[PDB]
Amino acid sequence: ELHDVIVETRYGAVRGRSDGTVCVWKGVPFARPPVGPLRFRPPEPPEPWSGVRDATRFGPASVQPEDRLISNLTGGATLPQDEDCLYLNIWSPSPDGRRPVMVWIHGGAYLTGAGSIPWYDGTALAREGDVVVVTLNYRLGALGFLYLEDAFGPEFTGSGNLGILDQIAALRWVRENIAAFGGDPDRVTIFGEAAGAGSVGVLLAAPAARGLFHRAILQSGSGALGVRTAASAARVAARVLQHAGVEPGDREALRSLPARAWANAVAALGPGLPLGPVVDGTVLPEHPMAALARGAARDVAVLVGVNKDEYNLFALQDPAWLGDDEAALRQRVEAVVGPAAGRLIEFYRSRGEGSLGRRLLPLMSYAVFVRGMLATADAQARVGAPVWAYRFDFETPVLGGVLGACHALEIPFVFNTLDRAGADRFTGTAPERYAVAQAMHRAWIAFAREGNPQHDGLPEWPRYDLEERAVMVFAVEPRVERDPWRAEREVWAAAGVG
Amino acid sequence: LHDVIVETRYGAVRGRSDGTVCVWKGVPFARPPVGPLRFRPPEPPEPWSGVRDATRFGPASVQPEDRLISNLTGGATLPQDEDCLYLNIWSPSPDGRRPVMVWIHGGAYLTGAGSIPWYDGTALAREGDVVVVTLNYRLGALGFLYLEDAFGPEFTGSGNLGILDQIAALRWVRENIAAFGGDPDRVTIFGEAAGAGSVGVLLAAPAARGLFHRAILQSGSGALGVRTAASAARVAARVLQHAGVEPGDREALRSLPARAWANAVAALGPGLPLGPVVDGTVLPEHPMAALARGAARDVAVLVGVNKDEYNLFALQDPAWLGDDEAALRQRVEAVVGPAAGRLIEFYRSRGEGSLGRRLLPLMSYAVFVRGMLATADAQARVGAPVWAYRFDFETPVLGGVLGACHALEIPFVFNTLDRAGADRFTGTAPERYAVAQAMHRAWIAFAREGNPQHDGLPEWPRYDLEERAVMVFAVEPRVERDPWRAEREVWAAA
Amino acid sequence: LHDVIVETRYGAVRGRSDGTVCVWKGVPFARPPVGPLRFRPPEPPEPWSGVRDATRFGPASVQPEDRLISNLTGGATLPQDEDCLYLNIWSPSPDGRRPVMVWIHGGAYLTGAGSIPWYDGTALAREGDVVVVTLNYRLGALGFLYLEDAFGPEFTGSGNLGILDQIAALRWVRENIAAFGGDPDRVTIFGEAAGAGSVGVLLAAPAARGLFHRAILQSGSGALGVRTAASAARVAARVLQHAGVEPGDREALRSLPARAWANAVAALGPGLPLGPVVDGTVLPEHPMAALARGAARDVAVLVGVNKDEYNLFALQDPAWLGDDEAALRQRVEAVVGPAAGRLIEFYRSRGEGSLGRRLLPLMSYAVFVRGMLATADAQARVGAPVWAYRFDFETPVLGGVLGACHALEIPFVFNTLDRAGADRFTGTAPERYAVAQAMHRAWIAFAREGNPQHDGLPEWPRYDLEERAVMVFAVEPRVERDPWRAEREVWAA
Amino acid sequence: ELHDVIVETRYGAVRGRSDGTVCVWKGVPFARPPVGPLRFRPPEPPEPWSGVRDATRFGPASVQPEDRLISNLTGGATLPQDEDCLYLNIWSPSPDGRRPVMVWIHGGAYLTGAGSIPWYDGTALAREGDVVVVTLNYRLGALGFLYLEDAFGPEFTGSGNLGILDQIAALRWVRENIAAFGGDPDRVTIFGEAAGAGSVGVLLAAPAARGLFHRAILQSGSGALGVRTAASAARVAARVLQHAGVEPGDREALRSLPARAWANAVAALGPGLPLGPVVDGTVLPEHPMAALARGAARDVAVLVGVNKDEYNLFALQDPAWLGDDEAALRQRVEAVVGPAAGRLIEFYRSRGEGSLGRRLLPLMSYAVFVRGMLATADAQARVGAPVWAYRFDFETPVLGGVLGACHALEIPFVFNTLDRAGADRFTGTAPERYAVAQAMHRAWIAFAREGNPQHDGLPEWPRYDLEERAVMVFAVEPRVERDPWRAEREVWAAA
C-alpha cells in the first residue's frame, strides 16, 4: 500500500514514500555537508543534484559518543553515524495544501540524539493534527559546539554555536522549501526537549533566527539550560583540544583529526554538561534569558513545561543520588547553586521522603529544569506574549518507582509514539496512558494551529500569567494548578540564587 | 410451537415460535471461510433456492477444551467446524422495528459460541420487547492469527479476522433485522470479557462506524487483549512452529488440518496470546486512544466489572486461597510487572483473612477494572452518556471462594439462571432471581431508552469525572460514587 | 608517632610507628617505567645512598575514573603517574620474621591502586602479627596492551607487563621483607576479582613459582579477563587507531602521554578489553589448563565468591533490575552464547523478582562461580590442599538489591569498616563487626598457619569432589555441602 | 535509728550510717574532682584526707541536662549538680565479711543520670543477697565524651572516653579498697542499663577494665548503643565547639566555660545522642562487638536481656508511635536504618495488631535494643563464654497500657526498689509486680555471687546458645521461650 511521492526542492528533486495517508521523506539535506573546509564552519545551502535523490532511508547522525540512555532502558540502537550528517526528515498529510508545520530539535545534552530517533517519528503527529512534522540534525559535541575563537582567532567566530547555526539553516530550508512538501512557512512551530529545549531558548534569542517561527515549545529545558560564557567555553575547548592533541593555532592538526577522536576527546572530560550554547557575542550576542527578558520573543507564543521528577533520570547515571551520605549530596548541590547550597539543603531536607538525596532531587529538578521554565514563563507574561505552562505527572512504575515522572518520559505523549520502538518498557503499559498521551498530543497540535493548546480531551486551560501562574498538569486526571512552585519560587528568591 | 418463515436478502429462512417469542437459529451471515477463503476477510453467504432451515444452531468455531467453568458446570463441548459464521435471532414477531441487542460472547478470544444456552435471547426478547441476536466470530489462529510477516501484505487484516466477522454480522443485522422485526437504526452491541474486549475495538473500528449506536461492556474493555502488530507478529511464529507450517508456504498453510491450529495456539500456554491487533487497517490505532479522542462520543456506554473478577481463575490455579507470600508475589509480577512489590504492600494491609484473598482485588483491578474506569472517564471528558456498574452478587458454590467471579453475571443479564448448569455456577439461592431482573430491566432500559434507570433501581446518575457514580448490583442495589478513589491514586503514584 | 628507618637492598626508607604498628609507604620496587622504560619489563630501582621518605604513598597507575565505586567512596581524583611501581609494608616491627601477606587489588586491569583505603594492612598486622604488602602495578594499556605484532620483537610479553610488575614486586618482597619483620619464605598471595584473576595466573605462571607458598582467591580465577593472543591483538589494533599512533611509530609510542592511553581504552567501549594474555611465554598455556595438569600442585588455596556478585554491575545497566528480555538476552548471550536459552529457562523457574534479577545469578555463575569451582577442583584433583568459601553478608544499600555484592567482603577482610564511607558501602548494622572478624581472623590464620580454621568457626572441611564442602559466611557461619549442586548439573549440558 | 559506722579508705576515713543490717556511705570520692585544670583530663586518684569524712549525704551529680521523659511521669526534682561530681555510694551488710560486689553504671545516654537515684538503691540487694552494691557518678555530656584529640591536639587524647575513664577509676578504687567495706574484690559483677549497659559493653573492649569485674549484666543496651567513631565524635565535637564558642586549641576557653554552658551547647545540637563513647584508638582499640568477636571477653560470663516494648517509652515524647501518620513514622525509621527502611516496615506491618505506629515501635526496639543484645549474646556463646538471655514482659498499665514493657521498666524490678520515690507511678500498683520483682531481684543476686542467675523462684533457666537460643521470660508466670525473635533475626539478615 506504500507508494512513491516525488517532490522538488530548490536544490533538487527527492523521492519519498507515502501510503496514501502520510508521506515521509528521510535524509533530506538542508545544508552543504560540513566537512573539510566547512568543518567548524556555519552551514551553507545544499549543493544541487541532478536526478531524483533517494529519501527512503534515514541520513547518518552526527558523530557522537555512545549514550547508555539509549542502550540501557530503551532497546534503542547505537545510532548509525557520519560527519556528513546535515539531513532532515519530513512527515506531512499531503504535498497539496498549506498545513501548520512542527519543527523538532532533539535533546541529549548537546552530545547525543537525532531527528531520526524512532520515538520522534512524525506519522502520528501528521495524521492527528493536519500538520507537517520535520526533524533535523544539528552538529553535536566538539564538531558542533567547540568554541575556538580564543584558540584559533576570528576565522572560527561562532564555532561555539555551530549546532545552533545548523538549527537556523534547517529553519531557513523550511521557509524556503517546505511548500513543496505541503507546508505553510508563516505557521511554523519549533519544539524541542532537553538540549533541544535549550536550543529553542537559544533560537529565541538569536537575531539570525528571527522571522523563521511564530511559535516555540521548550520541554524540560530553557534558555538558561547549558548556556555558557565565552571564557568558560574557551577553557573547555583547551581541555578538549589537549585530549585531541591539537595545539591552538594549528589548522593542519584540527582538520586532520578523525571525527571519532573528536567525540572521544569530549568524552574524556567526564559526566555532565561539558559543551553547551556559548554567549559568543555574534551568534549569541547575550545570554538567552537576558534576551528573553528584553522582549525578543514578545510576538512569539511559547508553551513550556517540566516533568514532576525532572532530575530523577540522572540517578540511573549517578547512583549517589540514592545514598543518604550528607557530605557528597552537598558537593553535588554546591556545583549547581554555589554558596547558597546551605540554605536550600535545609529547606528540601524537611520535605519529601526517603534518604536526604531522594528529598534533594526536587532541588536538582528546580535548579536545572523548573528554574529555567518558571523564568521562561514569567518573562513572557511581562512582555505580553501568550504562554501556557504544564507539568507532566504521569509516573513510570519501572525500576521500583524511584524514577516517577522523570526526565524524557513525556516525549511519547506529545508524539503519540507509545507503540514506537517498544516504548512501553520505559513508561509501563497502563491503559490510562493513551488518554494523557492524546491529551498532550492534541494540545500541542492545538497550540501549533491556533496559538491555544485547548482541546476537548483537556479541561479549560487558562493562559499562563504572572498573577495566578496557571499550570496544566498532565496526569491520569488532568487539572490546572495555580503557582505550584510558589514555595520554591519564594525560597529561591530569598536564598539569593533565584 | 408454530413455524415462522422469514426472508433475508440471501434467501428465506424457517424458524420456530411458541406464540410468545420466535427464535431463528444458525442463520448464516457470511460465506464459509474455507479453502481459498480461509484466513481471508468474510464474504457474503451464497444464495439458496428453497426455504433454509433456521431451527438448528450451526457448528461452533474449532476450539481447545478450556473446561474452566465447564468442569464445575454441567457444560459440555460444542460441535465445531470452520464453517461457523452464523447468527441467531429471537424476536416476538417478524413485524416491527424493535430495538436490537447484539451479543458478543466471551472466552478470551479462543472459546465460546452464540449457540451456548446462556446466551438464549428468549427472556431478553419477551421482557423488554426487543430483538436479540447472538453471533459467532472466528477464534484463535483462524480468527486472530497475525500472518502479515509470514505471507506479507496480501493477508492484511489477518490479526482482526474475528472482528471482521463481527462487522459482517453487524452489516447483516442492518440488512436483515427489519425482516425479523428489529430496527437497524436501534442496534446495541453488548459483550462480556473477550466479547466486551471486541466491543471496545468496535468503538474504534472505522468500518464498524454506523453499524451500531450503543455499547455495553461487561468485565472487559477495549484495553483487554489488544496487541501491536510487532507483538502480534512474534506470536504467529511460535504458533507456526507448533503447527509445523513454514512461513511463506501457502500450500502448507492450506494443507494443514484445522485442528492443528487449535493445538498450535494452545501449546503456547495460558494468557491472552491472541487478540485484536492495532494493524492500522481494521484497527488504525489502539482502542484506548480512540476513547480519549471522543471517537465514541456518539455511543452510549454501560461499562462494569464483577466485584471479585480474578477469583474465577483460581479454579485452574488454587494458590489464591492461600496465605503463602512467595507464590502470590510471583503471580502479581506476571500481570503488572515492576509495580508488583509495592502494589502487594498496599493491598496486604487492607481487608481481612488470607493474603491471597487480600491480593485478589489487586488482580481484579489490573485485568478488568482498569480498562472499565478508563472507558468511563474518556467518555465523561467528551460528555458521551456513560453508566458504570459493579456486580456484587456472589455464588455460594466452592465455599464462597469465587464470590462475584468473572463470568458470573452472564445469567443475571440474560435472565437464564434456570438454564442447565447455570445454578451449579451461581448456586441455587432464591434471592438470585430478583438480582437477575434488576440488572435485566436496567439492561432492557438502556437498549430501549438510552437510560438504564428503572423502578427496581435507585436513581442512577450518569458517570462523571467529579462524582463518578457507579451502580452496584446487589441484593440491595445502591449507587456508590468514586468507589475506586483510593485504589486509583496508588496505581498512578508511588 | 616516630620516624623509623629501614634498609632495603636498594636504599634506606623512612616509615612511622604509632607504638603498635609500623608502616612504610611509597617504597619503590622498580625503576619508573617512563620514557625508554615505557612498554618494557620492570627493572629494579637504581640504588640510592641516604634516606628517602617512605611516609608517603607512591603514585597510582594512570586509570579511568571508577565512578561506580568512587560515588560510594567519594574519594577525590587519585594522584596517578606512569611512575607508579610502589608497594607499602605494614609490620609490628622491622625486627622479626613473620609470615607475609601480599595483596593484589582488582579493578579489571585498568583501574585501582594499593593506596585505596579499604586495603589498609594495619588491622591484619596489628591483630595477626603479620607483614602486609599492598602494591601498585601498571594498569590499562601500559600494563596489558599486546604490541608484539604492532611494534615487533622488543615487546615480547607486552600483553603481561602488569603481571610482570606483580612478579617484580614479589621479588623485591623476597629479598627485602626480612628487614621489615617478614619471613621471606612464608608468603601468601591473596587478591580480589582482577587481583584474584592475577593470582590464578600466578599459580599457572612458571616464573612465579616459589615466590609464594599459599594463595587466597576472592571473587576471581585464572580465567578472569584473560585473552588469547589472537583476541589481544584484535583489541590492541583498536587502541592504536583510537590513540592515533601508527604501528611501527616507535617514538610516538614512547612519546604519547600516559593519559592518552587511558582515554583510548575508554573509547574501545565497556567491558574487560585488557587482561593477561596467553602469549606463550609469561603464560605458556591457559591457567585452568595448567592448574588441571598440576602446575600449581604445591600451592595451597582458599577460593571463594560473594553470594550476589553481579548485582553491583546492575547500577551501570538497569536492565538486570528491569524485565526487558531482548537487552538481557543480548547481555546474557554475549558471555554464554548458545547455552543461555536453557540457562535463562533454568534460572527463570528458580528464585524471585525480575527476569533480569532472576537472570543475574547466570552472569555471576558464568564470570565468577564457575572459575572458582574449576580452580578448586583442579587443586583437589591434583592433590593440592584447597578450601572453599561463599560470602553471604548483604549490603542494605539501594533497597537491598545489591545483597552480597561484588567486593563487599574487602572491608570485612581487611577490617577497614571504620574507614571513610565504608559504612556507606556496608551499612550501619552492628552485626558486620562480627562478620568482618570471621573474615579477618581466618585470612590471618591461613597466612600464618596455612589452615583457615579458627575457634570462632564451626568445622570447615577441605573442598573435595566427594562432599564439596564450602564454608558459608553469614551472621551465623555454617558449612553448606555442594551448595551449587543444582546449578552445576545444568551448566555442563 | 541511724548510727555511724566508720571504715578507712586508702585516701581516708568515712562516716556512714548503719541500720544494724545495712551500712551506706554516700559521696565517697574515687578520684580528685575533675574541675578547672583537671577538666577534660583523665580522673586522678583523690588526695588522701585525715579525719572522719562525712558520708551521710549523697554527692553532687555530673552537670547534665534536665530529664522530662520519665521525670515528668514520676515527678523527679532537679538534680544537684557540680563539675565536681566523682563520688560513689556503697551498700554492704557489714564491714565484716567477704561478699560478692555488684557495681552499677547508670544510663542517661552519656548526658544525664546519677548513681544516687533512688531506683538504683542497693539496700534490698545487700540485705537480701549479702552483696556489696556500688553506684557511681561519671562525667556527662561535653566534659565526659568530647573527642578533642584532633581539635585540641595530643594533650586531649582519650578525652572522648573520660566518662569511660571515670568508671575505670571507680573500678580500680573498688579493687583496692572494697575489702574495707566488707566485699571481695575478685567476685565483682558489673551491671548497667541503657547507656550504662553500653558502658559495660564498651569496658569489655577497653584493656584497662580487664580483671575489674568477673561477670557483667547488660540491660537494654549494648556496646553499639551510643558509641561513635573518631570522625563522627570529631563531627559532633566540631559542632559542639562552634556552639560553645571555644576555638580549637584555645585551652583558656575550654577551661573557663561554665559547666551549664557545656550542657547548653550540647542541647543546642538538637535531639538524639550527640555524645558517646569514642573509638579513639587508645582507651578503645576496637569496637566492643569486634572485641567480643575477637574473644577479648571469652572468659567473662555475661547475662543480657531486653524488655518487650522498649521503644514505647518514647511514645510519651512523640505521639506518632500511637498515630497512623505513615509519612512521619517512616522518616523517623528511615533516619535510623537508611536504605533498609522500606523492606523491614513491610515485614513489621505484616506482623502485629493495632495502629501503624504501634506496629513500627518494635522496629525501633529491635534496631536500637534487641539486635545489640543479640550481637553481644551471640558473640559470647561463640567464644565459649557462659551467657544467659532474658525477656521482661511485664507491662505497665499507666496511660491506658500503651507503654507496656517499656525501656527502663525493669530497673525498679532489678533492685526491688518499687516503693522508692516515683517508682510506683512508672510501674503501676498491681500486686503482681512484687512476685515478678522477687524473681528478678534475686536473679541478679545469684548471677553476681555464682555466675549463674538460676534460683528456685525461677524455673530451670537454660544457658543461651546459638543451638537453642533459650531466653527466660519474666512475667506473672515466667516461662522459657526458644528463639522468640526468630522471624526478626532471619528477616534482618536475609532478603
Ligand SMILES: Nc1ccc(Cc2ccc(NC(=O)OCCCCO)cc2)cc1
Ligand atoms: N560493563 C562491564 C561488564 C562486566 C564487567 C565484568 C567484571 C568487572 C569487574 C571485575 N573485577 C574487578 O575489577 O573488581 C572490582 C569491581 C570493579 C570496580 O572497579 C571482573 C569482571 C565489567 C564491566
